[PDB]
Structures are given as C-alpha cells and as structure tokens.
Amino acid sequence: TYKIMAINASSLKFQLLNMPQGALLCQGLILKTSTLEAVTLLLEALTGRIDGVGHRVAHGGERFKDAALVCDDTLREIERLAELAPLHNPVNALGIRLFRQLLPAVPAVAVFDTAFHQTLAPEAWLYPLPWRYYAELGIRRYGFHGTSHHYVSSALAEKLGVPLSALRVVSCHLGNGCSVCAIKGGQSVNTSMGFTPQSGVMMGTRSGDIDPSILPWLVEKEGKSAQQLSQLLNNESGLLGVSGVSSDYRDVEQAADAGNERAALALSLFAERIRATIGSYIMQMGGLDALIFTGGIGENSARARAAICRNLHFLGLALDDEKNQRSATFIQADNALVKVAVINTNEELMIARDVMRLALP
Amino acid sequence: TYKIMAINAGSSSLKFQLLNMPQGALLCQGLIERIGLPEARFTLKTSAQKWQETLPIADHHEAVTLLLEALTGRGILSSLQEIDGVGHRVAHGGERFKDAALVCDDTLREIERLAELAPLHNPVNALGIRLFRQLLPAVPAVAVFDTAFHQTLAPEAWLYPLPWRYYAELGIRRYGFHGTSHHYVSSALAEKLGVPLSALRVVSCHLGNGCSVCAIKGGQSVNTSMGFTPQSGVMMGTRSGDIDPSILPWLVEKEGKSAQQLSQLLNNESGLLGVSGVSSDYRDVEQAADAGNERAALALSLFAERIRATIGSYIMQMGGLDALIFTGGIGENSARARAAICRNLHFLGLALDDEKNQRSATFIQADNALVKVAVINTNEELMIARDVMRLALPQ
Numbered sequence: 001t002y003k004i005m006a007i008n009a010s011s012l013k014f015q016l017l018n019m020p021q022g023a024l025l026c027q028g029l030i031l032k033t034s035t036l037e038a039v040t041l042l043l044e045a046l047t048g049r050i051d052g053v054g055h056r057v058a059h060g061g062e063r064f065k066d067a068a069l070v071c072d073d074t075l076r077e078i079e080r081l082a083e084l085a086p087l088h089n090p091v092n093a094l095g096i097r098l099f100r101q102l103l104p105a106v107p108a109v110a111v112f113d114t115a116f117h118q119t120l121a122p123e124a125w126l127y128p129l130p131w132r133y134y135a136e137l138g139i140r141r142y143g144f145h146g147t148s149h150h151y152v153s154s155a156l157a158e159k160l161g162v163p164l165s166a167l168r169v170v171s172c173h174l175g176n177g178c179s180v181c182a183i184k185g186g187q188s189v190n191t192s193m194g195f196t197p198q199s200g201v202m203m204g205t206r207s208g209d210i211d212p213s214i215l216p217w218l219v220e221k222e223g224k225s226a227q228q229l230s231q232l233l234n235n236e237s238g239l240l241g242v243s244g245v246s247s248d249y250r251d252v253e254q255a256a257d258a259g260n261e262r263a264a265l266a267l268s269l270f271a272e273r274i275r276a277t278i279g280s281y282i283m284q285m286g287g288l289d290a291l292i293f294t295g296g297i298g299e300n301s302a303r304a305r306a307a308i309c310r311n312l313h314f315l316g317l318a319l320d321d322e323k324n325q326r327s328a329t330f331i332q333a334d335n336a337l338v339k340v341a342v343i344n345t346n347e348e349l350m351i352a353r354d355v356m357r358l359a360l361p
Numbered sequence: 362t363y364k365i366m367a368i369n370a371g372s373s374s375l376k377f378q379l380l381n382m383p384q385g386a387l388l389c390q391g392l393i394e395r396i397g398l399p400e401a402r403f404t405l406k407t408s409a410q411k412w413q414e415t416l417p418i419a420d421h422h423e424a425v426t427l428l429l430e431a432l433t434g435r436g437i438l439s440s441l442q443e444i445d446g447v448g449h450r451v452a453h454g455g456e457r458f459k460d461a462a463l464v465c466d467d468t469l470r471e472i473e474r475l476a477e478l479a480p481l482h483n484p485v486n487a488l489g490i491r492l493f494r495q496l497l498p499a500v501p502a503v504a505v506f507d508t509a510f511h512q513t514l515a516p517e518a519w520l521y522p523l524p525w526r527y528y529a530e531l532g533i534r535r536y537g538f539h540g541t542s543h544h545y546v547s548s549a550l551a552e553k554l555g556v557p558l559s560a561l562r563v564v565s566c567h568l569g570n571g572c573s574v575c576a577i578k579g580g581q582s583v584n585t586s587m588g589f590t591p592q593s594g595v596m597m598g599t600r601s602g603d604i605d606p607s608i609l610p611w612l613v614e615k616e617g618k619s620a621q622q623l624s625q626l627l628n629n630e631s632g633l634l635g636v637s638g639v640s641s642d643y644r645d646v647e648q649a650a651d652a653g654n655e656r657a658a659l660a661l662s663l664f665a666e667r668i669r670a671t672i673g674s675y676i677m678q679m680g681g682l683d684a685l686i687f688t689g690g691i692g693e694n695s696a697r698a699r700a701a702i703c704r705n706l707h708f709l710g711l712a713l714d715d716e717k718n719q720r721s722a723t724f725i726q727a728d729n730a731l732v733k734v735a736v737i738n739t740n741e742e743l744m745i746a747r748d749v750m751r752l753a754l755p756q
C-alpha cells in the first residue's frame with residue numbers, strides 16, 4: 001500500500017520499502033533490485049528503471065526524545081547540534097534539505113541515533129566531572145545505536161508475545177561499532193556509548209573506555225595532539241590495535257586459530273569488555289529476563305556469543321550448543337531461565353515505521 | 362615481643378606507626394607534614410598522650426631524625442636497638458613485584474626504575490627507604506607495594522584495548538591500587554567467617570577519599586577498578602573515575618588544556634567536589650544534600666551508582682558472589698551509603714539488616730540473605746607490619 005524511502009547521507013545510502021509489510025523494493029548507494037547532487041541520479045533511476053522519506057540523523061542531543069517531522073525549525077535545531085556531531089549532522093540535514101526541494105511533495109521524518117536513550121536518568125548520563133562541563137557545554141552520556149536497540153528489543157517482545165515493558169532486557173549491538181543497552185519498563189535506562197560513539201566496549205578500531213589518565217600521560221610522553229589522541233581512540237585501537245591483524249572479527253578469529261597470540265587475546269578481551277557491561281546493567285535493573293545479540297557479529301558469531309555467556313548459571317543463563325551453532329532466534333538452554341535471542345537488526349525498517357507513525361497516522 | 366614500624370613517605374609528609382607484633386598493638390603513631398614548606402608540623406600520639414609542634418623541617422632527612430629522637434626522648438623505646446624491622450609503603454611495583462620485598466641495593470633500583478609511572482610517589486618512597494637504612498643500618502626493612510596484590514590479574518583484565526605497542530613498550534595496562542587494604546580486609550573476612558578465602562567469591566569496596574573495588578576469587582585478586590593510575594575506576598572525593606575518553610581531546614581542542622591541566626581536572630576538580638560544588642568530603646556533601654542541594658544529592662546518588670556498576674561487573678566475572686566487604690572512611694561509617702549501594706539485589710540473594718547496618722555491625726546482611734556483607738576496618742599498617750614479620754623475621 002505505502003512506499004517509504006529510508007535515507008542515510010561522503011555517501012548516500014538508500015532503501016525503498018513497501019509498507020507496512022516492509023518488503024524491500026530496492027536498495028543502493030552512491031543500485032540493486034530482486035560509476036561516474038547525487039540525489040538526482042537516485043530519483044532518476046527510480047524513474048528510468050513515494051509517500052514519505054525518513055532520514056537518519058546521528059545526534060539529537062537533549063532536544064529530540066523521539067523522531068520528528070521535518071520542518072524548517074526541526075532542521076534549524078538539527079544544524080545547531082553540529083556543535084556535538086560536526087562531521088555527520090550537517091550533511092544529514094543537507095540531505096533533508098535536498099529532499100526538501102527536489103522532492104517537495106513528500107513528508108519527511110528525522111530519526112535520531114540518540115533519541116531512544118533520552119530516558120536515561122542523571123545518575124546514568126552525568127559524568128563525575130565539574131558540573132559546568134554538563135550545564136555550560138553539554139558534555140554527558142548520549143548513547144547511540146538507538147534505532148537498532150529500539151528495533152530488536154521490540155522484535156523480541158513480539159516474538160515472546162508479551163509487552164516489552166514486562167521484561168528486563170540487555171541488548172548487545174555488536175558490529176564494527178559496538179554498544180550494549182539496558183531496557184526496563186520499555187525504556188532505555190543505560191547504554192555503553194557515551195559523549196561520542198567512541199566509548200564503551202572494545203570495537204573494530206575504537207578502544208571504548210580506558211583509564212582516562214593514560215591520555216595526559218601520552219600527551220607528555222609522546223607529545224600527542226588532540227587530533228592524534230582522537231585518531232588513537234577511534235582508528236588505531238580495538239580489535240585492530242590489540243590483534244595487529246585486522247579490525248574485522250572473522251579475520252582476527254582466523255589468525256587466533258592459526259596460533260597468533262595477540263589475536264586470541266583480542267577476542268578474549270572483546271568478550272570481557274561486553275561481559276563487564278552486561279554485568280553492570282543486570283545489577284542496575286535488579287535482574288535479567290532476556291539478552292539480545294544483533295549486528296554483524298551478534299547475529300553471526302556463535303563463538304563470540306558462547307564466550308560472552310560462559311559461566312552465568314548464577315543468573316539462570318546458559319546456551320544450547322546446537323541452537324547457538326545455527327544462530328537460531330532463541331539459543332538459550334531448554335532449562336535456562338533467561339531467554340537469549342539472536343535478532344537481525346533492520347534500522348531502515350525501524351526508520352520506515354517512524355515515517356509511518358509520524359507522517360501517515 | 363616484636364617492635365615493627367610502618368612508614369609512608371609522601372612528597373612533603375612522613376606518616377608512621379610503631380606496632381607490637383604479632384599482636385598488632387599500636388605503641389605510637391603520628392605525622393610530620395609540610396616538610397620543606399612553612400607551617401611544618403610534627404604530631405606524635407601514644408595511647409595516653411598527644412604531642413604537636415610547628416617547627417622548621419627542611420628535608421625528609423630532618424623528619425626521620427626528629428622521629429627517631431622522639432621515640433627514645435618520649436620513653437617509648439629503651440633504645441633504637443629495640444626496633445626489630447621497618448616496613449615501607451611503596452606506591453607502584455609494576456609487573457616486577459608480585460609481593461612485598463626485603464629492601465636491598467637491588468630493590469631500590471627497581472623502585473627508582475618504576476618512577477616513570479608513579480612519578481610523584483615512588484622516588485620519595487625510595488628516599489624514605491634509603492634514609493632509614495642510613496640512620497637505622499642494623500634494622501631489616503621490607504617494601505610493601507600498593508599494586509602487588511593485583512598482579513594475579515589475567516591479561517584479559519589488565520590489557521586496555523589500545524595498540525599492543527602501548528603495553529609492550531610503554532608499560533600501559535591496569536595495575537590497580539589499595540592492594541594492601543584489599544588484601545588485609547579480605548583475609549580478615551575469611552578469619553571472621555572461619556572459612557578459607559579460597560572458598561569464597563569476594564567483592565571488596567575500599568570507599569574513602571580514594572575509592573576502589575576489587576574482586577577476590579580463590580584468594581586472588583582477579584580484577585580491580587583503578588587502572589594505569591589511581592585516578593580511574595569509580596567516582597571519588599575529587600577524582601572522576603572512568604569517563605568517556607573522547608572528552609579529553611575535546612577539552613584540549615575547546616579549552617586548550619595542557620597535559621598537567623587535564624590531569625588536575627581528573628584528579629583534583631571532579632568526583633564529589635566537582636559534582637556537588639560543595640565539598641570533597643562525603644559528610645559535607647550529605648549535609649548539603651539533606652538541606653536541599655540538588656547537586657549534592659545527585660553527587661551522592663551518582664557515587665553509589667558507579668560503585669554498583671563495578672560490583673555488577675565483578676559479580677558476573679566470578680560467576681556469582683558469596684561476600685561483599687565495605688571498608689575505608691566511607692564504607693566503614695556510612696550506613697546510608699551502604700544501603701543505597703545494596704538496594705534491590707534480590708537477584709543475588711543480597712539484602713541488609715537495617716538494625717545491624719545502622720550500628721555498623723561486622724555483618725549487616727539480612728537473616729535469610731545468601732550473601733555475607735561485612736563492615737571491616739582496614740589497617741594497612743597492620744598488614745605492612747605482618748609483611749615485615751613474614752619476610753625480615755621468619756623467626
């Protein structure tokens with residue numbers, strides 16, 4: 001019945017969906033079905049070979065608790081938040097304006113990676129810095145992957161046939177970027193990425209959290225500039241820094257299986273960082289009913305999931321080897337109290353559902 | 362029967378205790394402070410008496426001479442031959458020192474070597490060792506390292522997810538601190554329970570002006586919250602603990618902070634002081650909170666939450682929990698902080714007995730709780746003196 005386009009803008013990803021069923025009518029980047037601004041070459045192929053558009057927006061600060069219809073004011077405050085996401089937000093909003101003009105008939109919705117986490121309480125988003133870093137400069141935990149965490153936790157409630165608000169859930173989005181999120185009463189109550197998508201657990205090239213006092217030390221012993229520190233934390237660490245082999249989980253796995261000791265330690269550390277975070281969120285929620293794995297690694301790596309779930313009988317959580325090995329939807333042992341799910345994230349569909357809810361009620 | 366002295370040298374201070382071993386009876390204690398500076402003060406206390414005096418003390422050499430002369434001049438010791446050994450607190454032992462060590466020519470070089478890491482502490486600690494060998498040449502000495510107890514951590518706990526180089530070449534990794542306090546109170550917990558530490562899964566919270574958590578399984582530390590430096594981990598009096606590392610390059614770009622300013626931000630302007638805007642002292646922040654200061658109340662709540670998050674991490678690492686220990690200035694005295702920290706832990710079988718907790722009794726868990734919760738006073742100088750007995754006086 002309905003045709004919704006999901007946009008993600010040095011690139012421009014796209015996915016046109018047939019709602020409300022969610023059937024993919026095409027996908028591409030700058031084009032597939034079932035070489036050579038660039039939004040025109042898109043709308044051209046559409047013809048030579050639309051009810052609404054939803055736009056991914058990287059940062060929504062404290063201003064957007066939810067997705068927002070695209071008007072000039074909401075565009076005003078999107079471009080304002082460039083002060084926090086300066087290399088992503090401004091061309092997300094440029095993409096919103098290019099569809100504002102080339103395709104002027106069409107309602108648009110903006111979907112923020114941060115909005116889902118705006119239910120965190122201050123004990124969870126305030127860093128123990130001098131107050132004025134928050135109150136005058138906006139430094140606080142924001143969290144990301146909000147669309148992914150939102151989608152898979154909802155999908156998990158549906159599959160179990162209960163209200164999401166009836167469950168204490170830990171959701172692990174494990175890809176090149178990685179984050180964990182605690183969801184209780186249907187609200188995100190904590191998540192592991194912080195002020196920027198750099199922090200939290202170990203990732204492909206990001207370090208995640210580390211002893212902050214290392215950084216002043218590196219400045220003084222190696223004269224690292226702000227750029228250099230940033231490049232260290234985001235481009236040189238994680239699986240790539242530790243292993244010395246690859247940022248890609250499977251390449252690291254292959255090297256560890258052929259004897260590489262730094263690779264194996266990388267996989268071991270990767271699992272530990274996530275296990276420690278899960279542990280914090282179980283503590284904070286006072287228990288656990290379900291644990292979700294998603295992303296390119298969570299959906300596909302039986303080994304990462306097995307290593308993350310080892311020796312958790314004190315929670316009533318254990319895995320079934322045969323189910324884990326096939327990446328079945330539920331992989332917990334038949335006598336386990338905690339459900340463990342492997343759910344494929346579909347952020348374009350989540351975005352499409354927001355365009356429906358907010359542009360076609 | 363044995364007379365052991367515990368020494369702790371700071372950049373401008375010298376703390377000391379004289380203990381009767383092996384019973385641990387405190388003979389005297391005191392502090393020389395503001396050495397080299399004006400307002401230098403020498404305080405010495407016994408069971409019965411206190412003495413205090415502001416006088417010029419030039420270097421640590423003069424502080425040691427004044428302390429030794431006072432031991433005999435105050436009748437505490439017949440003579441300095443009465444002293445049977447001296448234990449020295451040393452800030453950082455790297456990976457070299459898995460245990461306390463007899464002071465020799467070679468221990469001092471390795472301590473001075475480790476100064477690249479603990480720069481404002483290990484050189485003075487070693488000064489204190491060298492002065493005592495010089496002025497007490499016949500008395501054996503032992504170095505006790507704040508880090509040694511944590512050298513049983515596995516690599517997937519002490520490695521940070523940075524490039525390998527930063528560990529293999531620059532020594533960057535988690536070391537952990539409060540080793541002597543965590544050692545002491547976990548061993549004391551096993552003693553009070555009459556079971557061997559090896560039988561328990563223990564989480565230990567040293568909550569003072571500095572704060573750290575430590576997980577002890579099979580009688581060994583398997584994780585702890587301080588890392589490369591004593592700045593990190595949970596929230597503290599003026600120390601932030603862990604924060605989003607990407608904030609520091611941002612502040613270097615936005616505010617132009619130097620390395621030294623970044624480190625003052627993390628160590629001296631954050632924690633309770635930075636959040637509350639009132640004080641770094643728990644009691645002062647609590648007083649301001651109960652009078653309506655929303656920042657102070659938030660400071661006390663965030664302090665509890667960071668500790669709870671760390672406990673949660675360590676319970677999962679060990680696969681459960683048999684006991685929880687509170688100690689240090691805050692852990693030992695603030696029943697409120699312990700209640701807020703322990704709330705809603707039915708998923709672990711952990712609940713407090715309010716009567717016992719208000720009294721700071723030794724065990725405060727509820728009657729049907731599965732987890733033991735202890736309030737134990739830490740005694741680092743006692744732990745040190747016992748290391749001196751063990752190594753210099755095998756007897």
Ligand SMILES: Nc1ncnc2c1ncn2[C@@H]1O[C@H](COP(=O)(O)OP(=O)(O)NP(=O)(O)O)[C@@H](O)[C@H]1O
Nearest residue numbers: 174175176177178247248249250295296297300301
């Ligand atoms: N079969 C597999 N086994 C293990 N790892 C896999 C497998 N397939 C994919 N991966 C990993 O999963 C990652 C996919 O990342 P992806 O989830 O698409 O991006 P992302 O997490 O959204 N990045 P970011 O938005 O910055 O957080 C790849 O980089 C691979 O390393």
Ligand SMILES: Nc1ncnc2c1ncn2[C@@H]1O[C@H](COP(=O)(O)OP(=O)(O)NP(=O)(O)O)[C@@H](O)[C@H]1O
Nearest residue numbers: 569570571572598641642643644689690691694695
């Ligand atoms: N009765 C009390 N109730 C609550 N807090 C208290 C009480 N008495 C002391 N405190 C707090 O206890 C703290 C003192 O900690 P203390 O153990 O003396 O420091 P510390 O452990 O030596 N710091 P560090 O240098 O890292 O070893 C202060 O923050 C006080 O506010």
